[PDB]
Design a protein around this nucleic acid. Structure first.
Ligand SMILES: Nc1ccn([C@@H]2O[C@H](COP(=O)(O)OP(=O)(O)OP(=O)(O)O)[C@@H](O)C2(F)F)c(=O)n1
Ligand SMILES: [Ca+2]
Ligand SMILES: [K+]
Length: 430
DNA sequence: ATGATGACGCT
DNA sequence: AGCGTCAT
């Protein structure tokens, strides 16, 4: 009872750009705005692979991974924008630079953790304490929360979507104890006000819309963010967790979408995250290990402690290209030419990074895949990265992979290579 | 023949 | 270090 921690100590938000690469292309080309459209890479093989999809196009069934030729069968008027191609490969620079625009706006409000090109976690605990002191116990108006959903409401004793949203918000705000400065529900609500302001600033200063989740930890914030997209935000309170989790498939929780979650389902014979509450901590640790078991015991009760790490920049800078089916590299000269292409893009991104961010990479990771393996990587080897020079990096990568060549002939490469990857890691300040 | 990324855990 | 898992 009085000593049972409830995981209500932080206010954490997750901000996610809606269909991000599509928004970047629609900002640049107004002809694409408010249309079914997608971003594709390459074009020769079946129209290119779709990597991002506008919500108008999702209504027709267009998804990521689809070939554009097939997407066109579902949506004949689908508009397409192509990823830039440089040195024979996809170049994502435009989207990395757009992400920096958004991340720098977010950093004005709070320290952020860059989770991906288009996602950032925000720890709002301190910002919320300050805003509460500025209020001094004045109520929070619904006008301060114009795009916020309160998960689980309305409830209890209109048929339109915005009407539903406002009924739920009204019930939430009418129940709020605004005199208690340490009420977790109040803290979440103030967090949501700040996230409304953050999202307004992102849209004003970049043109990009996003969704967001606000809760007490990263897993609940990510789950919340997904509940109402696009261009909306959702508050998931601690009290909403039992009902929410009672029908939540286990695979929807971050880190449980793969083999571990499938094993939770198979071993325990359950389907929903709330069903985990019926096991002891020791039972869960016995099945899934000490760390995973403790994590599952707390997480199915809405409790998680993973911190929002203060990190706005990526930790690695990598360049990779697949060579599928018949295009697999079968000669020494082919392998050197593509290693050089990758190393030239890498050198350009590293030089830009060292000028912008005052750091240098010190380790070069080289990874390859051979025709036949089912694993995404067949071999990974590191060497020293001492100069930002593409010819040296490609020579060193070749040196650390050249003994993989099964061929007895010097000029041939067997088994042919279906993937090349160069990654700069282990940054030091400079 | 999805592809091109990127973070973190295990041993 | 090198390999694997999970995710955008
Ligand atoms: N497998 C993937 C997943 C994503 N992305 C790239 O990562 C970006 C963001 O990934 P997101 O958040 O998962 O999906 P969204 O497009 O933003 O759509 P939503 O509104 O539902 O958030 C994509 O634009 C991308 F461009 F598509 C990718 O390259 N490969
Ligand atoms: Ca997104
Ligand atoms: K995302």
């Amino acid at each position: 009872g009085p000593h049972m921690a409830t995981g209500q100590d932080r206010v954490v938000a997750l901000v996610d750009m809606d269909c991000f690469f599509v928004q970047v292309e629609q900002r640049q080309n107004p002809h694409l705005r408010n249309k079914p459209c997608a971003v594709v890479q390459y074009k020769s093989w079946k129209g290119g692979g779709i990597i991002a999809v506008s919500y108008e196009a999702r209504a027709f069934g267009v998804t990521r991974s689809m070939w554009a030729d097939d997407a066109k069968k579902l949506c004949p008027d689908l508009l397409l924008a192509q990823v830039r191609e440089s040195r024979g490969k996809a170049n994502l620079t435009k989207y990395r630079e757009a992400s920096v625009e958004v991340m720098e706006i977010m950093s004005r409000f709070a320290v952020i953790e860059r989770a991906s090109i288009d996602e950032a976690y925000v720890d709002l605990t301190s910002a919320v304490q300050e805003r509460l002191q500025k209020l001094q116990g004045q109520p929070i108006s619904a006008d301060l929360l114009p795009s916020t959903y309160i998960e689980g409401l309305p409830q209890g004793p209109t048929v339109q979507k915005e009407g539903m949203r406002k009924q739920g918000l009204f019930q939430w705000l009418d129940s709020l104890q605004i005199d208690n400065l340490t009420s977790p529900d109040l803290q979440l609500t103030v967090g949501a006000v700040i996230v409304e302001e953050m999202r307004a600033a992102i849209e004003r200063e970049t043109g990009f819309q996003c969704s967001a989740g606000i809760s007490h930890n990263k897993v609940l914030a990510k789950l919340a963010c997904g509940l109402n997209k696009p261009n909306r935000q959702t508050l998931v309170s601690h009290g909403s967790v039992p009902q929410l989790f009672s029908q939540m498939p286990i695979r929807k929780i971050r880190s449980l979408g793969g083999k571990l979650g499938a094993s939770v389902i198979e071993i325990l014979g359950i389907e929903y995250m709330g069903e985990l509450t019926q096991f002891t901590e020791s039972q869960l640790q016995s099945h899934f290990g000490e760390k995973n078991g403790s994590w599952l015991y707390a997480m199915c009760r809405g409790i998680e402690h993973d911190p929002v790490k203060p990190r706005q920049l990526p930790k690695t800078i990598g360049c990779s290209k697949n060579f599928p089916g018949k295009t697999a590299l079968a000669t020494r000269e082919q392998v050197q030419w593509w290693l050089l292409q990758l190393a030239q893009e890498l050198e350009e991104r590293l030089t830009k990074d060292r000028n912008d961010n005052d750091r240098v990479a010190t380790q070069l990771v080289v990874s390859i895949r051979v025709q036949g393996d089912k694993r995404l990587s067949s071999l990974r080897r590191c060497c020293a990265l001492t100069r930002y020079d593409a010819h040296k990096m490609s020579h060193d990568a070749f040196t650390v992979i050249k003994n993989c060549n099964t061929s007895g002939i010097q000029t041939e490469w067997s088994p042919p290579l279906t993937m090349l990857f160069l990654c700069a890691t282990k940054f030091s300040a400079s």
